[model samples]
Target chain A: SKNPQVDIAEDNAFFPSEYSLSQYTSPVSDLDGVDYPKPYRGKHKILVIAADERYLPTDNGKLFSTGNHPIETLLPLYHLHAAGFEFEVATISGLMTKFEYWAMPQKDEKVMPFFEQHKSLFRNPKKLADVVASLNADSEYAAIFVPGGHGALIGLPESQDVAAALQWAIKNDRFVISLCHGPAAFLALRHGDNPLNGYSICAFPDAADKQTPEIGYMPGHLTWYFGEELKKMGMNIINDDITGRVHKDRKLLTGDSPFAANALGKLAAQEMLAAY
Target chain B: SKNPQVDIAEDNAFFPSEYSLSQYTSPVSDLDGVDYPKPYRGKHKILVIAADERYLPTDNGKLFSTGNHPIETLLPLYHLHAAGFEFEVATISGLMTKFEYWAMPQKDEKVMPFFEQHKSLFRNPKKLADVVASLNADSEYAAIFVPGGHGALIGLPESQDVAAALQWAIKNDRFVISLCHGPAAFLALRHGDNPLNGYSICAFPDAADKQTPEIGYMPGHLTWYFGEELKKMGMNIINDDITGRVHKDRKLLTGDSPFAANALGKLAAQEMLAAY
Candidate 1:
């Protein structure tokens, strides 16, 4: 038996346990056969990237990552795995990564059979370096996805390889997706002078950054503003902090926060299928 | 200007800046010139594998990771890179990996000048499949290393490929090192009942599980105990979590935690140089 307080369902008000494949029945989900309506089209693989670290460093101390926040990493993977959408995991250093721990506290005694069943994919992820090595060469990826966490801010945005990947996606017209702190990856790519010059994207608001650190959702002190950062980069900021809202600009997909993780996953899946 | 409160240097009591290559002149380190002491003996590449996702679920929400703390990942890489050690990176899935964000939070604003100089290494790591694709073929690695991360617990112990890597290392008589949770990879390989029944090894203590998640170090809840699990699997668990103590049995060197990352890196370099 597990402690009730640590149940993942009890920890976050918006955790998508309702969409958990293990928890779903026929009517709620068409996962494999009956209700899992998302058919396995072509084996078009989607590339998902997660931040491997937990703390986002401040000039003073570090801010905490929700610890591979389920809303960001697992939820998206769950949606992908269940639908049979073939996806490969990649990271900045090509190692196994972490998530926002506090956000998904359901005891080990009570997580998921489905996840354990496919643990190999999560454990051995690809290195972003090898995947994006030959920048100008045609890529095997049909879509590029980055999930959110403060760690994403720590590493992903700083990677020139990630920016090159964005360029590859742009040239290939691949489906590119990001949520919450994930939009930070966009800070790396450039177009002449303006990389994000005219994309319709939604981002975590500047106002929320001021309130998150102490509330436990965000444990690191904010050093820079996400929205303010993007505004300077030339992004067309589409919405305020509407949690579930997602913005789509052709191949690019952006989400507000946890509320948007599932929707973003679904949309990415949809776009990949459409391409196929 | 960056906010001091959010700066990475202010949080940790023991930052490695004293050993920072950028700060070294000659006596403290020999990174590049007379200046650089450890000359590149050969182009022989050491194979380092980082864990991908930290958590592994059994049935429900229960998660377990062998967790490789970042000190084991980045610190070792830092020391090795500064010394001009030639090595290639690999993961279970061959994707980009991350460092421990909480352990070393010197702002990217402050950190990247060092990492970026060797950025190509991190950007294009190899895959286990490509390395050990032919089990009986000649291997290219001079040594095979596993850095600690709970993510390793998620995947390494469970991978046949990882077990094959271990077998290949043993067959090749190559130096094999595991820091902190990294030693957990050894548990994956077995021939009969006495797989590692006689081997001497050091591992992350089971007692420390109580302290990690709360201190902002590990966020994933453990589904199983690492030491206890190894004990059942015939590993001779040696040493306490004495921060930096590393143990060697033949060519296998295991460190307890972050404190061991640098020492393990140094030891691997020493062993590699001896071989050359």
Candidate 2:
């Protein structure tokens, strides 16, 4: 599908690292010499939480609904995916993966094409779920990954199951990675003290590096929610949450905003692969 | 980049799936969900192979044993390095990654300028094999990719280390993928009757899909290889061996040359994802 002589240098980036993925054989679970299988590949699956639409700056009645941006849900899955880890999505009941009514382009192309083309990847994954109700919810995957969409503020508050999932994963040493408003899902976890009390994590940096989280209009960046929550829990939080953050010992990974998915994923993979 | 008025109907594909990867992410194993990671926000760990190289027609390299196609050993590492994957390079003794000297556009053009701009990526990966005889040979990763060059054929067959690494991962269940002649790496796998004898697999069908025991020096229109060996060994293979051949029981995944990298990687990932 390549023409050598034309102005072939057009900007169609073929960077699989950016959006493509590759994996080897599986049923594999061994990171840092520790091996355990959850419902899927590893013990710590990443779950991405879709944002509540109420908070997105929409012009019409569409502003208030479910799923702010589906890509937020779709893209983050790569982290758990490529590393041979399993992941799931949890939107408010009756909701589907959302798309930003007005999110900027990572690549200068329309967002729908990716979905239009690869819909089945999401539609028919082994055990697809619109609502992950509990740890026993799918018990199939190990950890959870929640990517922030503009809807988390309201969505997170409305779902106690969501809160419990995060706390349970964190308390049990399972990896709970979230970005943007998705981290807001962590708001109601029942941890005794912030298990991540002394970890470095990223979100939208307090500035440009701040990941554009889709959580409901929380007071600040996605990092701020966990930043404050982890702080209150007695954990030391590095407020400079950009996109990448590791509570090294805490085992919880956080990204400041949407822009941080790449790093958050790689760091998580390193941990999972190490375990592999 | 989108001029809605611009029409590509004239350049459209002959088959809906022809230019397109017919099966993007097949459902064979226990794949559950996907996780997309944020780009540029965290430590992106990337690994590239330089286990073989193509000598630039020898005559062009008689003056320099280094071979005129150093990029064969360098370019891919370059792109990935620039994109930042904690780049590392490794290959068997006296061997670096190979390049398909026959495929170059001669004098570089787009290929030349792009890589020349990021020379460091090619040469600076952390592990360049300080000694001709060493490597950690770890198989834990989100993805393992190989850029094809004719060298894969020679080096893959000649290096037991390469075979061991690939075979180990495949047996353990990881995503092991290569491009172009890179599939030639499978030629080294020796199992039971043949290492891949009883597994379902795919490979470089004869470039000539029409020939059986091979034809003319061109290898006939059917470039089926690994499949032929697999069928003989009693494994279940995809029908598209080279293009169409069959095996039963074992699983074999293949691509149609370098053109199949993206599709192959995607399939490879799905295969691993299903293992949960």
Candidate 3:
């Protein structure tokens, strides 16, 4: 049994105990009544959340950005996409997300010719929603990824739609990942009567204040973040600096920063495949 | 008159001034031996600098970039190419500088089609010393610009060579502009005896701090900077937060940040035109 603190209903959050699609009447299916297999086994349905862009430390000020970090998205996506997993790119709002020019690690990947190739799809996301009902949104696929940027600043915070999706993702045993300023999603950000208050997660360290270094950074630029925030809501957290891998059984993983995005993606993929 | 505290000999640095071509000269002709007119009276000549991709706030991190924020180089190139400025793209070091993918403003400008079109030119750059000499190498253009990024960090510190070339740029009466960390060039950047010692310019505020901020950030975001490093050199600067406008008589101009890139370009052009 999971810790009582993490109990979904205690916080009134929903984590699909039974795959909803497995039980729900397919809202949108084949016109010919095609049969769909169990969630995540027959096909790889991957969802990526893109958001607005902001300036980089390189620019020293806010310039604007279109999407999240590629190092936080593309590198892992490339690894996953190459392995024959057909990935679907979606935004929290299911709207347009541009690339942050300065955040791109490589010159080539920085260019999204994919936009032109998939222009029609962006105009209309095939299996997309402006807001996710649960974290299990990617349950049908191998994993769900949240790329970081100032854009995710909104996607992660105060979006009950995304929050519900994330809690569902945790319960459904799906691969979930995010980096940098992105993980603020797991924090108790809902405006009022928030759910999933005890979800375990990590977030960006405060770069703004040196006075709060203890709270801003952990052992390695870690911070008193979503996990700490979740703790206040009566959630249990896992930390290398604390649990010594004790929380490994939680089925939920949190990465420290952008450096951890790739590792988190790989971990999610592995977990997704195991469940597959 | 510039302040005596600004010592060009000690801190100010230049690009590869006089490092490549004889007498700090450009080949004067591309592979075709076609001399692009100097002082491009009828057109515009622009220079872009590449920033290394190294993260700031890293322990003893070095300043460098592969290139790209040089979009500082590309935008005017875009406008002038259409405006009829005999455009030439060059960098501090001839090697194709990797760009900060996240920092780039226009996602389209960063796409493959755009890069492929200019691949032959950008794929390669002139060597260092030549890069600096190329500025005055020939009087082929009216204006010059330096883009921003962690890459600009190197140029800001102490480099005598770069300082000399900038001195040459001043004596020649050229228009110069930079944004974000790009403005560091005007700080106590050394040129001959007293470089930009007293000059106040904008960059990440931490550039002035004895302790750099982080691999990705400087102490202050963008609102201010550590120009004291340059103020002692003899150059004048105008940080974005400053109340007064840039000194009118001096050809020097400063920008708020990358969002200010276009405006900076306009100011540089105005000064260039006014000089000759």
Candidate 4:
């Protein structure tokens, strides 16, 4: 695993080279010329819960450099924005939102421009605790979108603030959108009644995560498997592999991995527009 | 600025590309072909304090990807280890130590192999609080090394555990070695009487840090400047530029930046070997 940019074997777990992205990312957007002919013009806005953490410690105590996958985040948001939906971004701590910059879609015309125009929102996000405090039946939020990177496994899974926000969305009958490791946030709900116990969803498989280290996508084995935990919570993980699969159980929407990001975005935008 | 590997203008706050290294790193070690003729056979070990956090947030809530600079860490450790001194690593939390993998010395045979050989120590480190609780005058550690990276600024400075370790080093007449932003840890003593007052040292210039964003070295302006805070503690900063400068004041040793990492290592090795 020698990267051409550096003279040594690419063994540093904190940064991956551009050559490694082919396994997880595609050079082009999967929108495939699909357009939202009718843009929603409503007072409701989407709420994005982004991760403020950038590193996930492996079981052996190695750090894997990760955060929200840019494609998984912006591609979905791009569709929502294109459909005239406004979104407000927030993190559990109101700190800067972390992103997997290494996984950004470099050549995608849609995501790149959208990222540039809206990068400030991520740079300074609203605090989730404050947002959670303000949530009510009258709040004009249409859905809560959680994007995925290994970072979602860091603080979101155990955060009570995340759990509260999800509870609000569920209680209000609002849409809940997430994908890949993003659904790790669902684990936060385990302490109480576990609203998602019987729900079916697509997620990054524990099997693929276990195999990421062989290809250098992960520095080491994850400390815990989210999928296995989700199964323990009695939520059926509908997919066993990474095949760009997206599933919706009632108002909960999810996808498999970055491969499923674009499709998940289209699904989210279409659903939110139609429901709202 | 645009990076050749990725089409988008380089604006991601969390990861800088390879092109940004020229301003902060040199391709070669500054050892000048110098060799330690004798290896110490002493049983005493060096205690290295490494940062576990990988991201430093700017004032506007943007994260700068940083950690221990590899050359700044390993180059010095290589000389000390070659002099036959053993070292144990620890972080504030018992988590994995973070490194600026982007700043690794690509062609340096000395630092690279040394890093590979001892990488496990970094992966799993002793918790600094436990090390502090166990410290006594009879402890066999000769020096406490704090390596530079903006990551050091994250938690090392404000930690009471770090202050306790430094107090132990000072009270026992042990050497204190640090460079660049590593001296930020010196600020830990500011809460009480500072022993380092009136000591002259070299550190990363505040002026250089202010300009790093223009060259894509830093994602944004730092939340606070350590050099400024160090001056408030009444320590003299002897160097105004990053020219691989090294300075020694009594038992405290310091350097300017990664350029000085190799030379600082040589100085620390000679000083510790002579004294012990």
Candidate 5:
């Protein structure tokens, strides 16, 4: 309730105070002013995939699913940009959508700059099929990254373009890193033997869908559980309850959720640097 | 594009070391410490309408239109709450929905306090038909307010319950205030003679639909031009190019756009005070 003269002190829940988030120091601050490693040396490029669907059914109904979870995408983009990799974003169609606005960085001195510079990548993206068709050889792309959000589950698992792209990457031995349920993209491969048969990977837990109160009431909306589907496909699925757990198998890398965004990002960067 | 850590200072666009927004003072801050004319003395109630449909088709494509514009609803809510009028939210169905989180208040200390205290009002609303069915007399309600978002353009105008309740409000001579396309609710009335024949009302302009670059490319989503529709209903449409322009006709009030939110809010409070 408001006071007689409207002294707005009780408005914290909806309108948070203008406060600073933790500082993001230069990833290269430890280099002591040297051009050490520079990661990919700006020689290689990475492909980041975005989902076409804009919403997901929640217990409360449907919420805008324009990748509302920022950490899932932001962390990797930051690390990749910091590691000197040229990253391009693509959707099933050449369309653009924005991240959840409240979830976006507001006034961080370090991170906000990064968001403002390449904000358009998420707003309007190139078509995944077009970019995949343009690739003359698998070497042209160092890695294919899929960021997690409920949005991708609808299109990523069923995309013919995505399926072909994943097959090409496998044929050429290119690195593939997926975050949380982002591994849903891997469900597109048609081989009888699981492509991830022996690879150990981690993803959004299917059990959490019905167990967590936040998601329990709307299990029907999530058509399939990514982790269980991966297991069915013969992959060794990691099922620990830890938040930031990430696993690596040869050229494959995966993270559990936003809790693992940073860990997955730094490791993905170092692995990309190791590719050459 | 990001430069190395040592070179961040040179990147002006991203680092935007300079940016500022015009400030807004407390709505009642100028009222001298006096408890002047509380709108309803905590007696009568106000009705604020929300639409169940979550999107509107603009030229750019379908945008999340579940009342994302805070100024449209927030400003009036603040004034009404502060002035001692108890307001209830109603929708076609009782289903709850929230404003676009990303486009929500970033840092307005004065108004944010109100949003926080009443955040759940939008999350779950009362059924409009039930509320109207329960009303014994129009005198029991001080006003029926409809705030604008493209969502209303879809369901609010087409709703049978909303149309009947609006007809009741007209029969009872209750105050009706709408902002932007909020007057779209008036489209529900079904009478032989034009209900608003001589009432000078203001609404979202049809031309601005194509002119506003933010919504230029995808116009198919918004099927009707609201201004043209209102003019067709035998009403005196006030065509003005001013932002924040609000028009009043007896007990009826309307505002032009989100630009008119605050002004329309204060005036609505004053008019309610004048009623009794």
Candidate 6:
């Protein structure tokens, strides 16, 4: 018999016994008891930018199967929808939105059903390029939401369209809501002048990412560290740990990880309602 | 608690309990208890084409964490190496070669040491485009080896460099060796006239692939079925199931899956020693 148990499931790329979700997921929605007593019936919408690709390659050439974390993606949307904010989903390439289905909250009555009802939008998102092309100073999109997962690192950071969308949002004074790896999209602004430079926000820490491989959470070391890269760009990563932390730097609202998904959503909904 | 286990390990995308390698791997090398008494020393070398990318995207935009299967890539090379054949590795890009490390045999003394010794070659492979550009009718490469894993489907099939390499191999009458998804590279030849249109070879069955998602082996359905696509190109896939089957149609040698790795390696070594 193999001592350390190297056998993986058929056609699979992970060791079954070494895998666990204890630190990564929760059964109850962090938004379970939270509520917005009043709703906004506004014509303005939230443009949800989702990941088109599902794989984040590691430094050693291994792939981490990843996409938008379901809880992070849907919980925020759940709060916004409950607050009567309609949203339009889009991807850089107009491909189907990829989700980290394995991380979906199984018994979250609020988010799960909400996802079920609105899942069609994720399946067929608008093209980001086209959405960017349609943007204007007086556009009806009140905010742009980018969800977290390793997938956020795949194509978002280098996309010109993402940069354009962020630029438009900033110029028009619209809110930018994101969490964890979602903030990686902000790196797109590095092409020219970075407007969000020197802004402080909560984000996934590099310390945890560097240690995940030891427990088989990651197959190998990440090709690049987003936290380090963001710091290099003059952005302040306020949180040094994965806690349910959320931060507001002017119109920019961000969270640390999926742990902060519900809090971030609540914050976003309350802020958007007051501002819009 | 979440029923059906929605939680994944921190920063990971797979469920732990649902994974198993029972059907996909064996504790011992299939080459164990078998040997070739005679070894051939030759000046010619085998050119190993490895996948540079590690992610295989599914139809629904989920990524399968995959790369070259360790047994499939190394076992055959082990046999050939033991038979005194030297090999050089290359990828479509000059990037490091990717491998399914989770599927590596833990207790296989023969293959593990061989991998450790030769791992450097995989980390620094030659660019296939550059290799192809330098190819001539009298190139020192006696055979071209393509190993199997879902990663093979990522870029090998659509790569112009891959097509050129296969074209050169066919034109120069060099032997072609591959197994399972490795043969998907042959689809690259579809750009023009397919030389191996009528050649029959064993490959991973489409039926197994279609069902792997049910057991969570695959995150979702494959974007395309290689077996069916191969048939469409007028190439015959000989195996309906994976059973360690190996086949030869003239200069082309193929096998079914990792189950066929050692057997295929033995066959490759014997044939090359005799012919070259």
Better of 2 and 4 by lDDT: 4
Candidate 4: Cα lDDT at B48: 96
lDDT of 5 by residue, B205-267 (tens): 777654432322222335567677666766666865536688889888778876677667777
Docking class of 2: incorrect
Q: What is the lDDT, from 0 to 100, of the residue B271 in candidate 5?
A: 72
Docking class of 6: incorrect
- lDDT for position B154 in model 6: 86
lDDT of candidate 6 at residue B169, scale 0 to 100: 86
| DockQ of each two-chain model | 0.01, 0.02, 0.01, 0.01, 0.01, 0.01
Clashing pairs in 6: A8-B21, A9-B20, A20-B9, A21-B8
**lDDT tens readout by residue for model 4, A1-276:** 513122132244455534566656776667543466545645477889999988777777667788898888987887787665767788999888999877777776556655654565687788899888988898778899999898899899999999998888888999999998999989998888687889999999999989777676766788889999998888899999989989988999999898888889888888887896
TM-score of each: 0.43, 0.44, 0.36, 0.49, 0.43, 0.48
Report iRMS values in order.
20.0, 15.5, 20.2, 26.7, 23.8, 29.7
What ranges in model 6 sit over 4 Å off? Answer: A1-19, B1-276
In the range B152-209, model 3's lDDT, one tens digit per residue, is 6554444454465566666676555565556565543443455344544544334333
Q: What tens digits encode model 1's per-residue C-alpha lDDT throughout A48-114?
A: 7767665554434533333355556655655554444556667788666665444552442212333
Native A-B contacts reproduced, model 3 = 0.00
Report the lDDT tens digits of candidate 4 across residue range B23-91.
556666565433655455454778999999887877666567788888878878877876656678889
Clash pairs detected, candidate 4: none
lDDT tens digits by residue: candidate 6, B21-58: 55576566676423544444334678999999876667
